[PDB]
């Protein structure tokens, strides 16, 4: 059956107010998921063993959230609970990818990591590992790894080692290719595929305020928008893996549940059409405090709704631009006023466009979807009354014809 890999970022239980999303809060999502990917573990740069990113939260000596997550497998029949390592959330050094490269460089360091994965899965009763490896990201338009060729071969060996250590206990091992990770530099697909239960293509964040502060564009297109960066769309990345010989059933497509916003200025123009000049991220989400980053509930609150129908200023509803091609995605915007104020351009996933991605997976015979992430879906049903609308629309279109 098709996979639905649902990420829960445990950091969200640390948030304040309506930003706090706990394990309990995401339980209503679990009937729609085949796997719960608990995010995120990291790597100790001195021992190369797995580490929790917040020990006080995750470990038995603290709040024990690892075990709260794995207990879910005893209340939701057939649900598999994996631990995801990396995800670009392991951010404790100035170059957060460096330890993900040096780990690969010796049998001793690879073995330390493998042994620490096995011990961690057993200790906390995880069902397997999602390898969301923090390779360096390709630089934004305007050398990535001088030892890329060495590291590519060492990564094949690491994945082989993990598989051989995990197989006796039937632990799941999957690979997640994070945004802007170039597989043709770092990954030997024909020598990886046989050791992986899935390959999850996190084909989103194609444009972001952090990488492209001066230009807004579609964050998660299915196909290539005209004259964009070749490869940076779902169809291109899935086809890359297929053309390397990967079984279609092993390929899973990542779907974001969030939006990213850019501040608009005078040089942005007045049409809202991308790519659009900008000046960094827009205002932080009301419930998270993260600049230019919005959960689906936060995006939907900015779109035309009865509460803000005739509101003005920072509250004036955004203009939605639907995508009739269904190839590129939705965006919404407010042109800056005559004082260059309150301008925002927001590219986001919604239930309809997430459904389009799941329907693409079904039509192409791929293996499933992943959801990045449950807590950025509309957990509480604030947008339209229905909880987990993005997840539910994607799951529905993954299995039901249009
Ligand atoms: C990933 O790396 C490869 C090289 O390993 C890049 O390959 C280039 O692809 C473009 C088309 O997108 C070609 O015009 C170039 O001739 C290719 N060069 C090489 C050396 O192969 C690829 O573009 C990279 N992709 C990203 C997104 O960075």
Numbering used by the authors: 24 to 165, 186 to 445
Please quote the paper that reports this structure.
No structural information exists on AgBR1, but based on its primary amino acid sequence, AgBR1 belongs to the glycoside hydrolase 18 (GH18) family of chitinases. The crystal structure of AgBR1 shows a triose-phosphate isomerase (TIM) barrel with eight α-helices surrounding eight β-strands, a fold conserved across the GH18 family.
The core domain is a classical TIM barrel composed of eight parallel β-barrels (β1-β8) surrounded by eight α-helices (α1-α8) antiparallel to the barrel. In AgBR1, the D residue preceding Q157 in the motif, which stabilizes the catalytic amino acid and is part of the substrate-binding cleft, is substituted by A155 (right inset). These mutations lead to the loss of activity that catalyzes the hydrolysis of chitin. Only one region of the AgBR1 molecule in the crystal structure (residues R165-V186), which corresponds to a loop between β4 and α4, displays weak electron density supporting a high degree of flexibility. Furthermore, we identified a K190E mutation, resulting from a missense mutation at the nucleotide level of the Ho Chi Minh strain of mosquitoes compared to the Liverpool strain (LVP).
